[PDB]
Amino acid sequence: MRVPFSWLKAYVPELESPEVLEERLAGLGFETDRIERVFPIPRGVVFARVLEAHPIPGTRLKRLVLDAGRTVEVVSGAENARKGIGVALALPGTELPGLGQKVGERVIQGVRSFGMALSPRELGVGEYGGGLLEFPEDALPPGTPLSEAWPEEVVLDLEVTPNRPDALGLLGLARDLHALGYALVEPEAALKAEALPLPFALKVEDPEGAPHFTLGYAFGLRVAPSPLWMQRALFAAGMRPINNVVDVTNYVMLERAQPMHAFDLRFVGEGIAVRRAREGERLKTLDGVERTLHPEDLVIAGWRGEESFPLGLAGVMGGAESEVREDTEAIALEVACFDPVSIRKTARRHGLRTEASHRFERGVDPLGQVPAQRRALSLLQALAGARVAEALLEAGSPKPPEAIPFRPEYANRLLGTSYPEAEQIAILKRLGCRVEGEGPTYRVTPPSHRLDLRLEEDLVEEVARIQGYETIPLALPAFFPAPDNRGVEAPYRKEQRLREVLSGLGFQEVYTYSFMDPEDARRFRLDPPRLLLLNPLAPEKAALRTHLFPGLVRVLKENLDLDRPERALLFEVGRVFREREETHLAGLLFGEGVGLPWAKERLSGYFLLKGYLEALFARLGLAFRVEAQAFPFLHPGVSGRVLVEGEEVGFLGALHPEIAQELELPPVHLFELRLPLPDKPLAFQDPSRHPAAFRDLAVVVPAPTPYGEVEALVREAAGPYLESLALFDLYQGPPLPEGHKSLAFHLRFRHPKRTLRDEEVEEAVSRVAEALRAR
Amino acid sequence: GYQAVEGPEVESEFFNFDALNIPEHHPARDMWDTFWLTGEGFRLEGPLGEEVEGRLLLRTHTSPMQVRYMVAHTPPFRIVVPGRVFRFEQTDATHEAVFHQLEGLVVGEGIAMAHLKGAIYELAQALFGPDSKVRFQPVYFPFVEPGAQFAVWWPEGGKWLELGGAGMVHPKVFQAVDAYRERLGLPPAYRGVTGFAFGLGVERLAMLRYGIPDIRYFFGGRLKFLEQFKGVL
Amino acid sequence: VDVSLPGASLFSGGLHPITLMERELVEIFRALGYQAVEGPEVESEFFNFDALNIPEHHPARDMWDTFWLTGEGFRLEGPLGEEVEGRLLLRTHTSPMQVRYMVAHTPPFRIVVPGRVFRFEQTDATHEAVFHQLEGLVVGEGIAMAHLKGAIYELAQALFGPDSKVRFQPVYFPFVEPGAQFAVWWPEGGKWLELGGAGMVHPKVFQAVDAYRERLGLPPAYRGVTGFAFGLGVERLAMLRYGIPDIRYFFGGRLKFLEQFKGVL
Ligand SMILES: N[C@@H](Cc1ccccc1)C(=O)O
Numbered sequence A: 001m002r003v004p005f006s007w008l009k010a011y012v013p014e015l016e017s018p019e020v021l022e023e024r025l026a027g028l029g030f031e032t033d034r035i036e037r038v039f040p041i042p043r044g045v046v047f048a049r050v051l052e053a054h055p056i057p058g059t060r061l062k063r064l065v066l067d068a069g070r071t072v073e074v075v076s077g078a079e080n081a082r083k084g085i086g087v088a089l090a091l092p093g094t095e096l097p098g099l100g101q102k103v104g105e106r107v108i109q110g111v112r113s114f115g116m117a118l119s120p121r122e123l124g125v126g127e128y129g130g131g132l133l134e135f136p137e138d139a140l141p142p143g144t145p146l147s148e149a150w151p152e153e154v155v156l157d158l159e160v161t162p163n164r165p166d167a168l169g170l171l172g173l174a175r176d177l178h179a180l181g182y183a184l185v186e187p188e189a190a191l192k193a194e195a196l197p198l199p200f201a202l203k204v205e206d207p208e209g210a211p212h213f214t215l216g217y218a219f220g221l222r223v224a225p226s227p228l229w230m231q232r233a234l235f236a237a238g239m240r241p242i243n244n245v246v247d248v249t250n251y252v253m254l255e256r257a258q259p260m261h262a263f264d265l266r267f268v269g270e271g272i273a274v275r276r277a278r279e280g281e282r283l284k285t286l287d288g289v290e291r292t293l294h295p296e297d298l299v300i301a302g303w304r305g306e307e308s309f310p311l312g313l314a315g316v317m318g319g320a321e322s323e324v325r326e327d328t329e330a331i332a333l334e335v336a337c338f339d340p341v342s343i344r345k346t347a348r349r350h351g352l353r354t355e356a357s358h359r360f361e362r363g364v365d366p367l368g369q370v371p372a373q374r375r376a377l378s379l380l381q382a383l384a385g386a387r388v389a390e391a392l393l394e395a396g397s398p399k400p401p402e403a404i405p406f407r408p409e410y411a412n413r414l415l416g417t418s419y420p421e422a423e424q425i426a427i428l429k430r431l432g433c434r435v436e437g438e439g440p441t442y443r444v445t446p447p448s449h450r451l452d453l454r455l456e457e458d459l460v461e462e463v464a465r466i467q468g469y470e471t472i473p474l475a476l477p478a479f480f481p482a483p484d485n486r487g488v489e490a491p492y493r494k495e496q497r498l499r500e501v502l503s504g505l506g507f508q509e510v511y512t513y514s515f516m517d518p519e520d521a522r523r524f525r526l527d528p529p530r531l532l533l534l535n536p537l538a539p540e541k542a543a544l545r546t547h548l549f550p551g552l553v554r555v556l557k558e559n560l561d562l563d564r565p566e567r568a569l570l571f572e573v574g575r576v577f578r579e580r581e582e583t584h585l586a587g588l589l590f591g592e593g594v595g596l597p598w599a600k601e602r603l604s605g606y607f608l609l610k611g612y613l614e615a616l617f618a619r620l621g622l623a624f625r626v627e628a629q630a631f632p633f634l635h636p637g638v639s640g641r642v643l644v645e646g647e648e649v650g651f652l653g654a655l656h657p658e659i660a661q662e663l664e665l666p667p668v669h670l671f672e673l674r675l676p677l678p679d680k681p682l683a684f685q686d687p688s689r690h691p692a693a694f695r696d697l698a699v700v701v702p703a704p705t706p707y708g709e710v711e712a713l714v715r716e717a718a719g720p721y722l723e724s725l726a727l728f729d730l731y732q733g734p735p736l737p738e739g740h741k742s743l744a745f746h747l748r749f750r751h752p753k754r755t756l757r758d759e760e761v762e763e764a765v766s767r768v769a770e771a772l773r774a775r
Numbered sequence B: 001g002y003q004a005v006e007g008p009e010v011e012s013e014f015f016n017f018d019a020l021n022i023p024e025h026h027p028a029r030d031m032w033d034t035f036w037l038t039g040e041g042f043r044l045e046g047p048l049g050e051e052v053e054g055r056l057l058l059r060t061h062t063s064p065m066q067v068r069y070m071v072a073h074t075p076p077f078r079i080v081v082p083g084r085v086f087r088f089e090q091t092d093a094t095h096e097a098v099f100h101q102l103e104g105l106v107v108g109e110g111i112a113m114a115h116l117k118g119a120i121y122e123l124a125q126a127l128f129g130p131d132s133k134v135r136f137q138p139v140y141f142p143f144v145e146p147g148a149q150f151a152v153w154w155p156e157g158g159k160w161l162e163l164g165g166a167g168m169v170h171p172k173v174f175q176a177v178d179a180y181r182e183r184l185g186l187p188p189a190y191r192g193v194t195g196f197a198f199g200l201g202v203e204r205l206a207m208l209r210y211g212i213p214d215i216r217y218f219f220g221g222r223l224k225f226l227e228q229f230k231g232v233l
Numbered sequence C: 001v002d003v004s005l006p007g008a009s010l011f012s013g014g015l016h017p018i019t020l021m022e023r024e025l026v027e028i029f030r031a032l033g034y035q036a037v038e039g040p041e042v043e044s045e046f047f048n049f050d051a052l053n054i055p056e057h058h059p060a061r062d063m064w065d066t067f068w069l070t071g072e073g074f075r076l077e078g079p080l081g082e083e084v085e086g087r088l089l090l091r092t093h094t095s096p097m098q099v100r101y102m103v104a105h106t107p108p109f110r111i112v113v114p115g116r117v118f119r120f121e122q123t124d125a126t127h128e129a130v131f132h133q134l135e136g137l138v139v140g141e142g143i144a145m146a147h148l149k150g151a152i153y154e155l156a157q158a159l160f161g162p163d164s165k166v167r168f169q170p171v172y173f174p175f176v177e178p179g180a181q182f183a184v185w186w187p188e189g190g191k192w193l194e195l196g197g198a199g200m201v202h203p204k205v206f207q208a209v210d211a212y213r214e215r216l217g218l219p220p221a222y223r224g225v226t227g228f229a230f231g232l233g234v235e236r237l238a239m240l241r242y243g244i245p246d247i248r249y250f251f252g253g254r255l256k257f258l259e260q261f262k263g264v265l
């Protein structure tokens, strides 16, 4: 919301300056996003009045005869240009914002234009530029430099939160500054109304949408351009002056957050009817756009006999036809309170967001209608010399706010402050609240324009902001936390230790979007995503990742294309979405592998990834092993499920080549698990001092058989004294069955209490060999 | 004394909006550009492992956790909630759709704003200072009154940094909690207790701290970037 | 390929149980705002005894079997990097740090001091000459005993409980009055564990601090402030916690032992 210092200053006279103001506002809850200086008018531009406007034959131009002190001529192409108005005349020699070329005396078409009148765009006071600025023919003594009556201004780009709709009005803010101790100057609406009856009627057929509705009657209107100060304020507010009457409705809408529209009686007929639109109703709105209505759209219509026609779109924008022009002498004034949701719906239903729409959506003072009408009519009488009827057409009696219970002690208790009761009340009272009661708990009824004030707490936030958030002291709480909160951190903590170990083991962490391209459900042989977006960021991120690894691999690629890393080892922990949200952990390896850089060999591939994997669990104190498993996305033979401490979770393997190639990518190795990892609480165990029993042993079994079962059996039969069991070698082997292999198994044994008697060693050894291939 | 706990990235419109004083058709709901979801057979778990209902979406901030935690526990307590959030927005050098926040909540009888103030103040000191300081301005949030936005003084770079929002937990939020608890069979625990909560953008701070220039950089899996923070600790 | 096969023999590291226990204890006190700081293993008889109300020829000095040192060219640093004098020895407990910290800082504060200490004793299944302690000190105006009590209580809860509890009995220490010994309730094993000693920092200790400070040019900071400190044996707790039976086990560099605590976290 634009905030013109000088204009606001009209209600809060004692303002120190824009900066101090920016300060004061920040503290009340309004942040300034920008500050600007705005109306620099060189001495060259002066006030002039159009005595005559003669059109140049054969051209679409006019030769204006101006009174600028001495008489003078200029040539203008502007349509609004005509006799009887005051205009902004930039004399030859004047430097203007827009044109870097100085203003001069150019011969235009048989006529030498002395300077040129200006458009708002040209003077730099507005964006318009499609016609001349129009002023009351008598605003100033011809010739007087304009800057004399049009001083630069300072405008604050303020941010008004949705909870402060009353702040969409400068007078709303003034009220707040006043609360800080500033003097407030409410504009007095002087009015000489007359007894006579209103020549029209009002019928509200949809009271749900129009809870409160009022109509004013003004006639004998002299529609003319707005006075300078008004044009100045409106222009500063970022709004464009049209004529005194329309201008007034805007000024007041900006003053109090109360939008209002003036309808030419010519088009009203018998009366005004606030009703929903009939399917397919047509309406050429104000912006010159022709539109068709939806039946949910509330509208302001009129009627003649048995004719009902739309006049404007209720609380959003008026009809182009009914709008006020030069030839208007009497109108009806719309000042109401519409239902926010309908406006919201209707507003967004068509491509619109107007000053009106915006305010009504955020909420309008339920009882501001009437005082607003007095304000506007008073202005009309003054600026359009309107004759005003003393009566209004009203529809719907809304209820006042209720008292809110308030305990000053509680306030302090809540803030952690010590403000004296009186100070608090004084504040609330300065904010326009009524305070009844003797204490300690009071009866506080807020002013109707305040909608954000319902609870006692809302009331406290007030004393706070007015006293100042900085006046609240600093403190720290001390307490023994409820017992059920004890362990709480464990999960999080667990995840992090893990996260850390990895990085220390040698993995680079990576962060990937939780999105997924539905297409990849194919590209990578996997089921489809169970969750889809209704408003995806892009069709390639329209689903929710079910797997982590796809993203990893994808990252691999793009890294290769940007920089060419020889090898790569990383991981990522993230949430995947299937039937339930789940925390997954995946890691990817690729490259030559590790070893001597210069020296020939490397050691990499799958058994490298496993190497690391095993060490990790070695570090977590968890038993892990792998068993071949068929995986749609994993190259078979190089596929395998993962068994953490006796459990099946995740997989590990070489990325299926079909995919390896479907992407400009070489061979990659993967694994993806589900967290949290289960945990084995350690059971400490005394190690014995008596030396172990050592053994040399090999096994010959089919080339297909998995290491697993082998170790498994040997191990399960070794006996209760098997300390160690390792594999130091194996090869297919010429000296044995074509379809069998050899196995170097190193063995160790020990007995806690005593040394192991050989009787039991070469004995238990057979216990194994027996059922070894006895199977 | 704050304890860390996480919530779900996929939430129910109930925990994300309704529980916290956020209306359906009013201007408030309109401050968070949400991602709506669809799909069946997806089971969303409530604070007590129960199944909950409501239009599915992507947590728009970490505040929902505020609720889940309260429903599931008893005051007094201090928690902090890190977590990745999602907002429908166009990704530029300082704006993302996917980012992280850190929520903080401290409930207990006697809690006041001065506590929040000290809380944040300690945080400042912890980050810069003791030559740094804190700025608290009033701001509006549906789940806290008083509401406020806070900035921090950066002695080095010499500027004020808007860090996050905070405030005194709103009464209707507490109300909500207890109401759902009873609906779950539990006795009310938040009548007669106070509390404050806050939440701050992590990426912003990380960028200022570790001196990163493009926020997009974080979700851009480039190694040359990632490695740059190898020995950060 | 046979995937069930063993991968590349990669080294899986681990941490020493004391380190783990130390860590655990530290993380605990850290949540109450205590900050960890260490001192020197080789101290001056001044910081080890004199600074804390411990006399030379009286029964108190006689509660700590100290290791005396000898040798030249050894430079002992004081709290401010200055060189200090006094017969050299091996810190008999971590309390000296109490002083060094106070001399070097300003209240209010909360610190905790882990550290290896030395006592001349015969090494058995439950007694060592070399072991670790964890000192705790919290100074500030207003500090009282209830604070110490809560401190310890929180610690209990943190370790066992909330079905556990604390026992505080009066005991005598030259650097604290009131002095006390505290035991903790172990719900699992069902017994009371004497954990360590604590108490309200003795006035003569504060006196000492300020006196040395001024001798160093600094203004007095401990007049009108209160404080409590405590110290507990780490090995004992580690043994009870991780279920170890022989205290000698810790300094016995046997791997089969050390590895047993690989994944403790
Ligand atoms: N997470 C909130 C920040 C906040 C948290 C708590 C209180 C107030 C503000 C947001 O989305 O902006």
Ligand SMILES: N[C@@H](Cc1ccccc1)C(=O)O
Binding pocket: C092, C093, C094, C095, C133, C135, C173, C176, C196, C197, C198, C199, C229, C230, C231, C232
């Ligand atoms: N470190 C002390 C224990 C203690 C510390 C502080 C106060 C009281 C006792 C000791 O050697 O026994």
Ligand SMILES: [Mg+2]
Binding pocket: A452, A453, A458, A459, A461, A462, B145
């Ligand atoms: Mg308020």
